Design a protein around this ligand. Structure first.
Ligand code: NN5
Length: 259
């Protein structure tokens, strides 16, 4: 063991363990002076151009703004930003949805509906402040006392290419709309209902990209008991964004509204 510490805004935090890594950043599970648990993202800035800098600034301002508007955006309690570093002290999470999906045996229908609702609310909120994530996937969500929270806003830059909307693959917000996030949410719900994503069993990752965009390539929707849930998935996974369902539509759909 150690007595390793972080000072952020003068307050001391003992480190319990590291949890995130990589891009000039680390996340740490942490104890404050009142022994209360938190998470602290750290970012080293020596190596960061003005664009990566302006993005980090932007994530922080949005995390700030959105807090007020929803309890499904991950809570930021305090931050310290300097020419050399950023420290952010955030509420702490049991596990991320991505790791949770893979270990969870089956999945309670009343639990999935609730996680769906959570996800809808969070994305709806960011949409109402003109953020269109565009790279949604289970990792972007965190379970905190049985409640999904959005952590990332697709705002500040092998990954699973298994939640990726058709229109993202066309250039390769005049091409990407809010409807892009519906697709991705659709895939996350598709995992939670049929145990796997639409093109999980598809071969070379390039070979998936063809099926995503291919309009003659049908996605299967087995008859599950929840008829409403089956419709949600079909409406979310339409290739044309013009015909794909909207988030405000999805919040009025009987799946989320009748129980
Ligand atoms: C990068 C970033 C992170 C966060 C952020 C905030 C709180 C938080 N609490 C937790 N808690 C855990 C603990 C464990 C696991 C897990 O299942 N693991 C399996 C293998 O990979 C390592 C850990 C996931 C989450 N994570 N986590 C992250 C917020 C924001 C806003 C960012 O930008």
């Amino acid at each position: 063991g150690s007595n390793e510490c972080i000072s952020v805004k003068g307050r001391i935090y003992s480190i319990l363990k590291q949890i995130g890594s990589g891009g000039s950043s680390k996340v740490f599970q942490v104890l404050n002076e009142k022994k209360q648990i938190y998470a602290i993202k750290y970012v080293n800035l020596e190596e960061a151009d003005n664009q990566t800098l302006d993005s980090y600034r932007n994530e922080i301002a949005y995390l700030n703004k959105l807090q007020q508007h929803s309890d499904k955006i991950i809570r930021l309690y305090d931050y310290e930003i300097t020419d050399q570093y950023i420290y952010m002290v955030m509420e702490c999470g049991n596990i991320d949805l991505n790791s949770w999906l893979k270990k969870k045996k089956s999945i309670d229908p009343w639990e999935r509906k609730s996680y769906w609702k959570n996800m809808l609310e969070a994305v709806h909120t960011i949409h109402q402040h003109g953020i269109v994530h565009s790279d949604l996937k289970p990792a972007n969500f965190l379970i905190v006392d049985g409640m999904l929270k959005l952590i990332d806003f697709g705002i500040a830059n092998v990954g699973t290419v298994n939640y990726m909307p058709p229109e993202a693959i066309k250039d390769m917000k005049s091409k990407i709309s809010p409807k892009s996030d519906v697709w991705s949410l659709g895939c996350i719900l598709y995992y939670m209902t049929y145990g796997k994503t639409p093109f999980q069993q598809i071969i070379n990752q390039i070979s998936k990209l063809h099926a995503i965009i291919d309009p003659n390539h049908e996605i299967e929707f087995p008859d599950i008991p929840e008829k409403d849930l089956q419709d949600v998935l079909k409406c979310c996974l339409k290739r044309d964004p013009k015909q794909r369902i909207s988030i405000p539509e999805l919040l009025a759909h009987p799946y989320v509204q009748i129980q």
